[PDB]
Design an enzyme around this catalytic site. Structure first.
Site, mmCIF file in Angstrom:
data_model
loop_
_atom_site.group_PDB
_atom_site.id
_atom_site.type_symbol
_atom_site.label_atom_id
_atom_site.label_comp_id
_atom_site.label_asym_id
_atom_site.label_seq_id
_atom_site.Cartn_x
_atom_site.Cartn_y
_atom_site.Cartn_z
ATOM 1 N N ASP A 42 11.111 -19.628 60.514
ATOM 2 C CA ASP A 42 10.544 -20.770 61.233
ATOM 3 C C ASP A 42 9.688 -20.333 62.490
ATOM 4 O OD1 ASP A 42 12.488 -19.563 62.917
ATOM 5 O OD2 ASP A 42 13.493 -21.439 63.329
ATOM 6 N N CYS A 45 12.358 -16.261 64.353
ATOM 7 C CA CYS A 45 13.422 -15.487 63.772
ATOM 8 C C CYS A 45 13.533 -14.178 64.481
ATOM 9 C CB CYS A 45 13.173 -15.194 62.253
ATOM 10 S SG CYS A 45 11.536 -14.442 61.937
ATOM 11 N N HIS A 211 8.412 -11.439 59.316
ATOM 12 C CA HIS A 211 9.735 -12.035 59.333
ATOM 13 C C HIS A 211 10.747 -10.917 59.567
ATOM 14 C CE1 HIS A 211 12.662 -15.118 57.844
ATOM 15 N NE2 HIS A 211 13.410 -14.039 57.783
#
Length: 221
Positions: A42, A45, A211
């Site tokens: 989102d 992270c 990520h």
């Protein structure tokens, strides 16, 4: 959930068919790491992962917890020195500090993970870590300015790329937060500036497509 249970390394392949081109790398990770936890994707992270994984590493370590608690108690002064008004960071500080006290007094992984999986307390925790990052940047502007264009303003950078929720981190932010909290971090890369291998890191992260998930070292047996 925001932060998953621990799963097999090889689950990075078995799940995700996109990941089959990196199978040999994932298999080498599987010999150095014993588990991965997944973080929601989102744009928060990095902050959520580092903050969970680091607080998890402190569980049961009295003297490390002691020294961390004392650093976190000085953080309001970094914020204030950077220009933030006590009024505005107060609720974020309180929520961070209350997870540090959970670590100290409760001491359990399940209670920690429960805070980090509660959307509201977890986002406050993220917002704290973001304001801390920004403070640290701004108070060290003479250093961090070397990382953007000389005609760009470091303050704009903090206002727009560090402070708001859901802004992706990059090397400046990772360097700033890790230094702010004195965290020894090792980032592993599944496939623009690599992070170094660490001597005795408290936190390992796995990086792929901007990520971060959390790794657990099988540094053992």
């Amino acid at each position: 959930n925001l932060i998953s249970e621990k799963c097999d390394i090889l689950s990075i392949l078995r799940d995700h068919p996109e990941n089959r081109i990196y199978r040999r790398k994932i298999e080498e990770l599987s010999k150095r790491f014993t588990a991965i936890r997944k973080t929601k994707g989102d744009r928060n992270c990095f902050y959520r992962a580092l903050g969970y994984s680091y607080l998890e590493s402190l569980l049961g370590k009295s003297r490390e917890i002691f020294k961390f608690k004392e650093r976190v108690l000085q953080t309001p002064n970094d914020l204030l020195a950077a220009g933030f008004e006590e009024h505005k960071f107060r609720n974020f500080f309180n929520a961070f500090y209350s997870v540090v006290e959970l670590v100290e007094k409760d001491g359990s992984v399940s209670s920690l993970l429960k805070v980090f999986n509660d959307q509201s307390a977890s986002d406050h925790i993220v917002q704290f870590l973001r304001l801390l990052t920004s403070a640290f940047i701004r108070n060290r502007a003479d250093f961090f300015r070397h990382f953007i264009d000389e005609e760009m303003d470091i303050k704009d950078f903090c206002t727009h790329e560090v402070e708001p929720m859901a802004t992706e981190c990059d090397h400046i932010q990772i360097t700033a937060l890790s230094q702010a909290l004195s965290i020894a971090l090792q980032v592993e890369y599944v496939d623009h500036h690599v992070f170094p291998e660490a001597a005795t890191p408290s936190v390992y992260l796995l990086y792929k497509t901007s990520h971060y998930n959390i790794l657990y070292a099988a540094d053992k047996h």
